[PDB]
Amino acid sequence: APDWVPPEVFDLVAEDKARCMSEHGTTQAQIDDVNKGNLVNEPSITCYMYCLLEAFSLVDDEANVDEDIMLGLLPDQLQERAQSVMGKCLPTSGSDNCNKIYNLAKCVQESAPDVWFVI
Amino acid sequence: APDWVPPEVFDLVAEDKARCMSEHGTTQAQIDDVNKGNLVNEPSITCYMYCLLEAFSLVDDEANVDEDIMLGLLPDQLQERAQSVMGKCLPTSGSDNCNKIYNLAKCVQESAPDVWFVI
Numbered sequence A, B: 001a002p003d004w005v006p007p008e009v010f011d012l013v014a015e016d017k018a019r020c021m022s023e024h025g026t027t028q029a030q031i032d033d034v035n036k037g038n039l040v041n042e043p044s045i046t047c048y049m050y051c052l053l054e055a056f057s058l059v060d061d062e063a064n065v066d067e068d069i070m071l072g073l074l075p076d077q078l079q080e081r082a083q084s085v086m087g088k089c090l091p092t093s094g095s096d097n098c099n100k101i102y103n104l105a106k107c108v109q110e111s112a113p114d115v116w117f118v119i
């Protein structure tokens, strides 16, 4: 992940990472690819992102981001940049929940590739 | 219903929607509620879902689901997502036909909000 990610997040997500990878057939290799800017629209990775976001209430049942909860989780250092990115990329839109998260990731990647990551 | 639902289904279901709502005392408000994630175990809605499924030959007289045709009628991306969810949530179980379909809908909505919809 990017160097700014708080160490605690790696432990906080561990339980849901395992569950979500199992549920969606996700490989660590796919995850490693999102982080190197190589995102593809395949449910095994896009629904995995949805799954992990939902675990932390970062999105609701229609894959709309909760900006407050997202800003809460992000370090103080990223507040300004993240708020700008959210302004540009939200609300989410797409045919289903996984597509909404794919579309969101692509939007964030355009301006701010280091703000999005997959764990 | 979700944005991914094929346009054709709204016309294809119309005849059976009328018949099934009439048979079960269903109101549109109840159908709207399911699509908002507010599924309640009332036979006027749970038996309605059974009735629509039966109309498409997706259930038999004991609310056994035809997994292969149900999956086959879904768009490609939903079909992929649904393979794992239906793997988990099928076969149906419950005290009667309407409870079996309630339990199925609840199971699907827990993993995959945006997959179980009603018209």
Ligand SMILES: CCCCNS(=O)(=O)c1ccccc1
Residues within 6 Å of the ligand: A013, A048, A049, A050, A052, A053, A056, A115, A116, A117, A118, A119
């Ligand atoms: C801008 C943030 C990116 C979110 N991507 S993620 O689904 O892998 C995820 C990462 C961390 C916590 C929850 C989900």
Ligand SMILES: CCCCNS(=O)(=O)c1ccccc1
Residues within 6 Å of the ligand: B005, B006, B008, B009, B012, B070, B071, B073, B074, B075
């Ligand atoms: C001919 C129209 C196809 C129906 N496709 S559907 O995705 O709405 C669907 C509805 C109910 C069960 C499975 C799929």
Ligand SMILES: CCCCNS(=O)(=O)c1ccccc1
Residues within 6 Å of the ligand: B013, B048, B049, B050, B052, B053, B056, B115, B116, B117, B118, B119
């Ligand atoms: C993924 C399957 C959803 C089934 N929901 S339904 O039984 O109300 C229904 C909707 C549309 C056509 C037939 C049945």
